[model samples]
Target: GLRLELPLDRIVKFVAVGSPLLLMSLAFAQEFSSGSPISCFSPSNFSIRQAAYVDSSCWDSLLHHKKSLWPHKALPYSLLALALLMYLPVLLWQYAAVPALSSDLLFIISELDKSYNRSIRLVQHKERYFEFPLLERYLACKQRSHSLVATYLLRNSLLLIFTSATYLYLGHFHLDVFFQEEFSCSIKTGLLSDETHVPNLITCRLTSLSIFQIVSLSSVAIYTILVPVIIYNLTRLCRWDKRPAFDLLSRKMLGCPINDLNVILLFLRANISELISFSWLSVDFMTLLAG
Candidate 1:
């Protein structure tokens, strides 16, 4: 009942959503491990206290100063947000479609499971068993009108959009910013605004610069891989519907017309090969009874 997602989909979601958190944690560890986020070169005239203040003030105004380094500071936090956004599609699927799909899946699975031996007994009392097949009534209850397929497609679409946005963020827009390792900071704070001894532009090194680059580059590589997988997954279902096929199976299963029930049974073929066996046998059993 819980096997709603395929193995490839589950793996992609796990890696796509999980890798950012792992990278963010490592970046934070490096940020905190280094005593200071930035270290500046102090002039010969400047005292130790003044140099400390320069480092402290520059880190404080990291975003306001030259601002190239602000993106560095924002890197880990953005990864944190990226991880959260990637999981939204999973949440959407779980809340919107899983419950109904699971119920129907379990009902069909159990019916197929129990009907195996019952079918053997049915051959002995064909008229009695075919006269009251519970599965036929169940299939008749659920006709063509259904939203499960739409919800499934919606989930795939959302994931594709989010993944593409992630790719654009890392691979396109901020590509050059992540490569910056050093930036000049101005110590023109309220206290140091008028200080003649302090230099205006102090060269400083961002301690976690390499880590940000690593995280962003790796995530870009991963998202590059994810986009194609998501496209394949989305298109697979779409192509399955285009084929003017499964007509014999559909008619044998439903007796009247093709509906979403046919789609549901088709999905069951992927989730449980045993269902395919049950499906063929059920058709033969019904034909025998009809004869």
Candidate 2:
């Protein structure tokens, strides 16, 4: 039996979902420790209290700006949401596939282990039969169970989609928005709309915009690396199966082989290094051929 989780898959899960959270907390800590989310330039005639009022009003009123400062304010929250989105596929695999996968792996590994143990002492015992008597039936029962592969493919596809979507967002769309530090913020509300002293538009700079720029830049770069990693993770199986080694093992181990079980055995190759090393040895060629 193969383990449900593989080394490469788990590594991708950790980095893809975890790095954004790390940056997100850093962004949050910076935001909380700062005095103001944004700052504004008021006319020299305006008093300190009036300037303070302008800053507060403009920060709250993101609606009137050509380029809303909201992206800056919402940066950390966006990253947080991205982390959650990235994690959803893992959650899907865990609930939808893990239980069934775990049970199957447990039985298969038990069978493989016992059989391998028998092989270790074969120089002493002259019994000619391979030890996988139950595995043939077990794999035959699972021949038609294709849901596990479907679920796993769905999980990987979903992760790739989410990663690409975020990559576009951070790399192109928000890329332009984050570069500009200053924007004209208009605060025309209620009584202020009629006040002569109130300027129609106020000049404002999102003080934390630089930090957000750094965060987005780093994340986008990371996503560039992640995209290829995920693609490889998805396609590695195609390459893995190309080798004749597993095919030989599968055909000899089970008289009639199925694709669903083949997928599990492929995963087992990654988890069990011994599987690759002793795979041919396990076949016991002379004994099986002689019988």
Candidate 3:
């Protein structure tokens, strides 16, 4: 049906949802390389198998660790979470706003088309077409209608909020929480408690910590740039079109056909000029009527 989103919004939404997703895929691809993501140095007496198990076990814990503790620590996985948060507003608009906005736009365009046709009839033959131009009042009523305006602003506002929060969240982790590439892992706890010479602390270092920082910093850059753009998107909605001459030059009495005709006639020569291609109807409609 009618796609109500502007071209810019479509691209902006794509960039908003796509950037982090791209980062996550690259991160996973990097992870699929040679060795495990974490390498643990279990004590010298530990078997090779036990040391390897320590690495995998620690990796598993890192994945399931509390998010409040370290936000960017789970880069590839939680980037999916960031992406879903980014997509939420667009999904909200697609569901709630697009249908209503599409319907109203179609309604207004159809109404304007009819009003234009009737006004042409009046101008051509003094045909007593409409009394008090229907669209004249319709436009007046729609000018103050804020339902779609509020909905649009809300969608962009949500995006701005999510973007700002995610950027700052990543900033916090990158600057402090995730900088320590090495973490101590305990391999002696669990079912293997009595079965091994594993020390209580097996110092583990993330094999790809540098890669994680790079990916996370790239995401921070994307979200940072996106914030101001969304703010501008929200502010652009408050703009108004050039004042229509009909409103400025005409009276609102709605009393007679001739005057109503004149109001719409003024519109064609001014605002509605491109809708009907003024010359097509302005000078030659009745001439074409004779054929």
Candidate 4:
């Protein structure tokens, strides 16, 4: 059975990916409660009729004069999409990455534990110093032969790229002018165009501007925090723990020849043996140096 998730990953997932959506939802909650996305000032006896037409049309398509404000206004709506795209890497890691790493990790843990216990049993049975443990050699043989570690690293590297790209996407849109949102419109189209008395333009305002900024900024902050957390998580997994030195020592010791003496039971004081084995090759060099 493969371990699927870690607490940090889960926490970062929710906090990082949920901020955009939750913040937008909060904005929308206020938006809908107010029942007015935009309001316009009008001057005429037919103000209600003109306002009704503008409301329905602009609600669906903001006929504002300025084109760029469209993006600023729509940015809040886009956070839903931002939240989704941000999680794509996480979902991809869950589907393709975690399983391979989990299988390898569980196997290594079981083998290491088995190695320790078997070595203890050997000391008790008086057969300890004779045999080369397969765990080390299997680990040795595994060096440069396994693809799982490389594959895991590559995926996480891509995960960082995805996250970095997200920061860029959010950064690209932040502007002081984004706060100055406007939604002015003119209804001189269709039958109204013939009316010479109709006003050429009506002033309007988007009430959700502050809420939209809040959502985008919140998303940026949370996602930025997740970047370092994810990299730290990757480092914690791939770091070496004297495993390489142990590999070389295992190989050299296995080459020495000796006559069988009921398998020399060198009651390897378990924890101490690791410190010795992990760094033993240095002393081996000193022996050759004492010419």
* Residue range with the least summed lDDT across 10 consecutive positions in model 4: 259-268
- Tens digits of per-residue lDDT for model 1 on 1-291? 246767777888899888988988888888778878778887887878888977887787775355444576577778888878988888887798778877888887776666655555655542434643566666667754656767767777888888778777666656767556677778766676787777778888777767766777787777777788888877765433422013322444524333556457656866765453544555464566533
lDDT of 4 by residue, 182-280 (tens): 756767767778777767777777777777677667766776777788898667544322223234344444321221100111112212333224434
How far off is residue 98 in model 3, in Å? Answer: 2.3
Error of 3 at 215 (Å): 1.8
lDDT of each: 0.69, 0.72, 0.62, 0.58
List TM-score per model, in order: 0.78, 0.80, 0.72, 0.70
Residue 175 C-alpha lDDT in model 2: 61
Clashing pairs in 2: 1-108, 1-109
List ranges where model 3 is wrong by over 4 Å. 1-3, 43-45, 61-73, 117-132, 189-196, 243-291
* Best of the candidates, lDDT: 2
Give the Cα-based TM-score of candidate 2 against the true structure.
Answer: 0.80
Candidate 4 regions exceeding 4 Å error are 1-7, 122-133, 189-191, 234-239, 242-291
- Which pairs clash inside model 4? none
lDDT of 2: 0.72
Q: For candidate 3, give the lDDT of residue 128.
A: 35
Ranking by TM-score: 2, 1, 3, 4
Q: How badly does each model clash, as a count of residue pairs?
A: 0, 2, 0, 0
- Deviation of model 4 at 223, angstroms: 2.5
Q: In model 1, what lDDT does residue 142 have?
A: 70
